Amino acid sequence: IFNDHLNTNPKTNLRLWVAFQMMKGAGWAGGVFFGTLLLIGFFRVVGRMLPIQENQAPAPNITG
Amino acid sequence: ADKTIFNDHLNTNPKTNLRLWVAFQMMKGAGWAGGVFFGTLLLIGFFRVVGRMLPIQENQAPAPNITG
Amino acid sequence: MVGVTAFGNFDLASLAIYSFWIFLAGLIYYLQTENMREGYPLENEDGTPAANQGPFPLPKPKTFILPHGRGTLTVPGPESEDRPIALARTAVSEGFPHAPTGDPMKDGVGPASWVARRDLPELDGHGHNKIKPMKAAAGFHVSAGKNPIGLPVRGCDLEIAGKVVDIWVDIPEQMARFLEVELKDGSTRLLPMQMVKVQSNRVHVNALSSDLFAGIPTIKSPTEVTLLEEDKICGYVAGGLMYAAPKRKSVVAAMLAEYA
Amino acid sequence: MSKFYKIWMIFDPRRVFVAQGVFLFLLAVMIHLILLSTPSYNWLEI
Amino acid sequence: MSKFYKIWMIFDPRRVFVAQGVFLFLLAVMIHLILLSTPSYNWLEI
Amino acid sequence: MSKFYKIWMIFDPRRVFVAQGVFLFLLAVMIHLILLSTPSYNWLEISAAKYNRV
Amino acid sequence: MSKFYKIWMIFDPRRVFVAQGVFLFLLAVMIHLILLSTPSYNWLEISAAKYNRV
Amino acid sequence: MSKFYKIWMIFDPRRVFVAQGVFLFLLAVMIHLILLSTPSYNWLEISAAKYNRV
Amino acid sequence: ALLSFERKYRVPGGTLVGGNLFDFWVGPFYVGFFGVATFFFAALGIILIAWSAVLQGTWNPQLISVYPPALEYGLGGAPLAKGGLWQIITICATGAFVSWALREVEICRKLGIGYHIPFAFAFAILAYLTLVLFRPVMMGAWGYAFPYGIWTHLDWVSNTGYTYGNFHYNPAHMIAISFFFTNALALALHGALVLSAANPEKGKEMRTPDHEDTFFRDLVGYSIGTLGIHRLGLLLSLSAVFFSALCMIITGTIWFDQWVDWWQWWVKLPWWANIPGGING
Amino acid sequence: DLGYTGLTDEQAQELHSVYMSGLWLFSAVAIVAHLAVYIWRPWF
Amino acid sequence: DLGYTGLTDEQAQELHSVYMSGLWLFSAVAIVAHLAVYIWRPWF
Amino acid sequence: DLGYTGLTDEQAQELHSVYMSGLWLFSAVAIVAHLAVYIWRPWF
Amino acid sequence: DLGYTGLTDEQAQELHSVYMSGLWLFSAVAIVAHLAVYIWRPWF
Amino acid sequence: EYQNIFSQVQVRGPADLGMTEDVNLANRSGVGPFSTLLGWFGNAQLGPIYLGSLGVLSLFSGLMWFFTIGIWFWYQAGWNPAVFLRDLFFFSLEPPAPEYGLSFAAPLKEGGLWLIASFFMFVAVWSWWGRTYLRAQALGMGKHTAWAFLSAIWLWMVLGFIRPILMGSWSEAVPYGIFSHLDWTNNFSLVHGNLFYNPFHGLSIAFLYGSALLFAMHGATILAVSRFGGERELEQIADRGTAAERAALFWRWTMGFNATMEGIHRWAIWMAVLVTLTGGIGILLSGTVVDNWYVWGQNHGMAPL
Ligand code: BCL
Ligand SMILES: COC(C)(C)C/C=C/C(C)=C/C=C/C(C)=C/C=C/C(C)=C/C=C/C=C(C)/C=C/C=C(\C)CC/C=C(\C)CCC=C(C)C
Ligand SMILES: COC(C)(C)C/C=C/C(C)=C/C=C/C(C)=C/C=C/C(C)=C/C=C/C=C(C)/C=C/C=C(\C)CC/C=C(\C)CCC=C(C)C
Ligand SMILES: COC(C)(C)C/C=C/C(C)=C/C=C/C(C)=C/C=C/C(C)=C/C=C/C=C(C)/C=C/C=C(\C)CC/C=C(\C)CCC=C(C)C
Ligand SMILES: COC(C)(C)C/C=C/C(C)=C/C=C/C(C)=C/C=C/C(C)=C/C=C\C=C(C)\C=C\C=C(/C)CC/C=C(\C)CCC=C(C)C
Ligand SMILES: [Fe+2]
């Protein structure tokens, strides 16, 4: 109804239309990346919760 | 101004065309802001590089005002 | 007298600095009061005198005796527009723009404004007209730089508007003031020198587009120009900067318009 | 909070959105620089 | 280099643009993580 | 307190709202900087001493 | 307080309200700053001393 | 003292009242600062000593 | 709140940014987008100066001083109490100056006059940035900038000058001083001449530009005209600021010793370097 | 009837009534603030 | 009766109602923020 | 219905709905960023 | 004229022009970013 | 776009010999050549220059002052042209030593020549001031140029004449020579503590920076409204056009106040006069009333301790 956006010229209208397209796809990609980052962070916080600092275990694998 | 020929961008419903037109507005404005800020940053960097190229380190002046 | 103090630390130096502060305040008062000779008293946006008139009062009237029997001028005094303004207030509250009602370039509002000056030619010290066309000015000729006569005049839309026929020159200062441009229709208009970029091939006018070259005001006598006509022509050409922007064929302006 | 939409009957969205974008970028840059100034939270040096 | 536009007569822009966005974000994340791994250029620790 | 609405018969809302926004942001920045100046309430340093980032 | 209302016949309400608001804000800032200057009444500092922050 | 009203036939009340307000505020600030300067009558420090806030 | 002729010039348009969001006046002032920015930056800078006065402890305006970070902080940040306030105030001042210039551009556009005035202001802005930004960055620390005090930036001037002996022996400095002096002379002459032409001897008619040219040809034998004298004033002022900026950009950056040694090159020219007699040799 | 601003008597009276109401509200808030401060830390 | 901006009484009342609603929302958020800060680190 | 810009009620409601949707998206991204930073290096 | 998608020559040319404009804008921003990083901390 | 910095075309015609009232045209010389190099910037015509009685007196005195200093520079060089070019800037015509005080008993090689050159300079400058006043009076103008020159002369006299008298020695005055007088100013600073903490020195610097600021502002304004013929400022004073109105409204919308086409020149002349006025007062006080400006500043709240 607002119909004031229609005043912008067409070539710009799509010069932003596919701005929208391509980068929307990778905005999905960014959502995935930050979801994984927050999952790793949640597990780090739960690791900070437990009495693990008092006693830890050696490396299972050796030579690195 | 002249209408485009591909006309398949016209298939998006007006509401999402909106949800990107205004994006375009507000954040074209801050694209200008980012251009200004990065221009000043590059100017500072150019003067830093010219300062490195010159033998300032070997001989340098003491602090003009007290307490550095 | 070195080191002697009347009281506290006050001495000759402190006396001088304080007397100077007093003098500086008085001088600022005097200078601002002198600067309050034109444009006062303040008006409202409709035309009635305002409630707020300033901390500095108006000065005593003074009179200038103009040369060549042109009369006398008294300032400050009763000042009126002496013309109708074609503007309409956009908002009720004070401090908002007044939009033009018709054609701003013809109505003479905004950057294309003009003041109802005296409708007489400007006179030098001897009593002759200060600005004369060069062909009627005896002994005058182009001395250096690119001669503009005979070069096509180009408008801001990259279309030729006419050809330069003559140069108007200030007789005392010996500096060119106006170009005379003849259009397709055969009539001749004036353009100020400050608005033209005399290039190798053509005289370029970035203020006005070609179609607007006919809209410039004309002069009564071909051998002189009055202050009022000067004002009208200059205001028209200068207001072309703002009010001919759409017709202006500029690459960067086009890119900015496409951006916006 | 429901009637806040009426602000758009007061302000043209174009000017408001341009001002908002400029302001947000300016504020973000200011805060990042403030963090970079302090020896702590200067993530580069940390 | 002039005739490169004809690539759009080969590929639908929608698929190409989606793939391009995903690829660019993935590459940027990869390079940032690689920089964060090394003790130098780990701007946080520096 | 009821008749305060009449202030809008005195001031254009556009100018008043612009001035209000600028003033509020300016005041908030001023107060935050004042807090950051003092060694106490400098929340950055209060935390940095809490967790030993020095 | 009898006929003070006639002051609004002398001073435009808009300008007077603007000047009064500016003046009140600046005065309050000045007095708060003066209090912050003195070691006592520096509520941040004396609070830090009372609660043994430093 | 009766005819003093005729001063208003000399001066516009608007300018006189503006000047009077500015002058009175300026004088009050000056005197308060002068009192604050002296170690006595510096009411802030007098009270800080009375209640031993140091 | 309008001049007798101001009404016909208050029209929309002529704004670079913001459409008609801030296209309105407050009293006589014109606000605009950059006017809003200028007001914000100016208010913040002034309040931060007051707060730095609170931290310093003194309420005397002439003693208030906002020192930059010491040399040990390099080009990095500093605590707000001991260096940060200076940097925030400097960012505020730079923003305020730039926004003031751009607001002047908008007013020029709305009035249809040329853009000479913001361009002239840009020279003063560039000199200030040379003293505060370019030279300290080139030299390697924020401690080479000047403090924000009324009498304490004179201490910066004095110390920076005497680091290089008598600073008078700086050529880009001699040229700038001569430009400043010529500018003051030209300003006095121009003001006095136009006043004497417009306010002639008592009871006489107003004089004309012909009389001005006659007076200055009688005096010194050359008259530069009215357009000439305004051009000359603009050029002299801009050139003075430009050469002062140059003098401070090459000091401590490509020249490090006493400045009279520079003048020693002319003495050592091959065809008079060894001749005896005179002051030098 | 000076009317340097064009307001009539009724308009001036109404405006002054509202302005004084606002002034007294502001003064009341200031008074309670000063009482709280004086109780917390008297300056006399 | 008095008029300086062209708004009528109904428009002024509606505008003030909405503005006060926004002001009270802002004040409520500020109050909860101050409560949180005071609990975390009191300044009295 | 002041209409200083010329928008009707429906246009204002639609514009505000879209603007608030964008604001909430921006706020959500900011919140997840702050959570990540706080987990990495808390400031309290 | 393979026409695997259905675009004509004019549509392809216009699309490529706009896409290349976007690519060059992105590349310009990347170049200024790399210059800033290299000045701050060169890797050669 | 054309910025009006330089003329893009020059026209020339009959030479303007100037106005003629209460002026003796016999003294007015002939019109010199037309210089195109200057014609690019301003008027190309040189002359005619009025050579009156005071003109001849000033020219003779100034020539003798310049030649006296030149001959002393030659003597100081061993009359070697190569040394004269190598040490042109380093020569000096020093004032008499403090041993002689204010006495005229200094030998010609250690103080007498300085007194002779000083007398010549005194005569030249005062005759030139009389010339400026008389030239203004001949055309019937106001004497504003005379009074601005008087301010400059006041500073010059305080530097060279009055202050040595008050201090009681000719050694306090300024030696003629480029680097000599630069060193004189530096030593004048060092002897009296920082001259920076002289309040009148600060005011003088304030008005010098103000002169530069005001001339930049005025030149830019007039060049910006020259497209309306604003450079004809006397005409604008006589009949206010749109150039004056546009300039006034620009400055009013910028900083809340403005000048008129005439009053801005009052601002200009005062911002230029006060430089030398306050400088003369400050120099006069130094040494006579204050011997250490840094300690004075410390006692007057300017310096920290
Ligand atoms: C280390 C050196 C000292 C110092 C030492 C002094 C001393 C000492 C003095 C000044 C003076 C001045 N200084 Mg200081 N100065 C210093 C630092 C500064 C700084 C700075 C940024 O650091 C600045 C901007 C200034 C600026 C100034 C000026 C404002 C002022 C001179 C006005 C003038 O026009 O004089 C020059 C103008 C004239 C001499 C007028 C001449 C008029 C006569 C009529 C001309 C005759 C010409 C003759 C006949 C030849 C004509 C030949 C042909 C006909 C052409 N100083 C430091 C602190 N400065 C002066 C002053 O007034 O101080 C209060 C002064 O005496
Ligand atoms: C240590 O610090 C020292 C001591 C040095 C400094 C001390 C300084 C001294 C001098 C401080 C001085 C303080 C005095 C001078 C300040 C007094 C200020 C008071 C008197 C100002 C009053 C403010 C009242 C305001 C808050 C009220 C405004 C009312 C509005 C809210 C109501 C709106 C009115 C509209 C509705 C009228 C419209 C009506 C219709 C008809 C249109
Ligand atoms: C050192 O100590 C210091 C100096 C720092 C302390 C100093 C403290 C003092 C000096 C600071 C003073 C602070 C006070 C004075 C500030 C108080 C401000 C209040 C007034 C906040 C007001 C907020 C108003 C909110 C943001 C309202 C917003 C409006 C909403 C968005 C709705 C608006 C919608 C409009 C009305 C549409 C209606 C249109 C018509 C058609 C109905
Ligand atoms: C030292 O400490 C400091 C000073 C740094 C701390 C200071 C802190 C304070 C002073 C800063 C204050 C920050 C607050 C006030 C900023 C909050 C900003 C909020 C409002 C963020 C808002 C974001 C809005 C988002 C970006 C909305 C975007 C819009 C979307 C893209 C959708 C728009 C689509 C439109 C509506 C199309 C609709 C068209 C019609 C036809 C339907
Ligand atoms: C090759 O060309 C030749 C050699 C032929 C000619 C060229 C000569 C060149 C080398 C001349 C160089 C001249 C120098 C460079 C001029 C420098 C002048 C300096 C810079 C002037 C600096 C300061 C001037 C001071 C302020 C003078 C003030 C004048 C006093 C106010 C006058 C006081 C008069 C009193 C002392 C008179 C007392 C004696 C009588 C008998 C009472
Ligand atoms: Fe002028």
Numbering used by the authors:
A (entry chain C): 6 to 69
B (entry chain c): 2 to 69
C (entry chain h): 1 to 260
D (entry chain 6), E (entry chain 7): 1 to 46
F (entry chain Q), G (entry chain a), H (entry chain d): 1 to 54
I (entry chain l): 1 to 281
J (entry chain b), K (entry chain ab), L (entry chain aa), M (entry chain 8): 6 to 49
N (entry chain m): 2 to 306
What's in the article?
The reaction center (RC) and light-harvesting complex 1 (LH1) form a RC–LH1 core supercomplex that is vital for the primary reactions of photosynthesis in purple phototrophic bacteria. The RC–LH1 supercomplex comprises an RC surrounded by the LH1 ring that is made of multiple αβ-heterodimers. LH1 collects photons directly from sunlight or from the peripheral antenna, light-harvesting complex 2 (LH2), and transfers excitation energy to the RC. In contrast, some Rhodobacter species, such as Rba. sphaeroides, possess dimeric RC–LH1 core structures, representing the largest photosynthetic complex in anoxygenic phototrophs.
The Type-2 dimer (3.45-Å resolution) adopts an asymmetric structure, with one monomer consisting of 13–14 LH1 subunits and the other showing a widely opened LH1 barrier with only 7–9 pairs of LH1 αβ-polypeptides (the last several pairs exhibit poor densities), completely exposing the RC QB site.
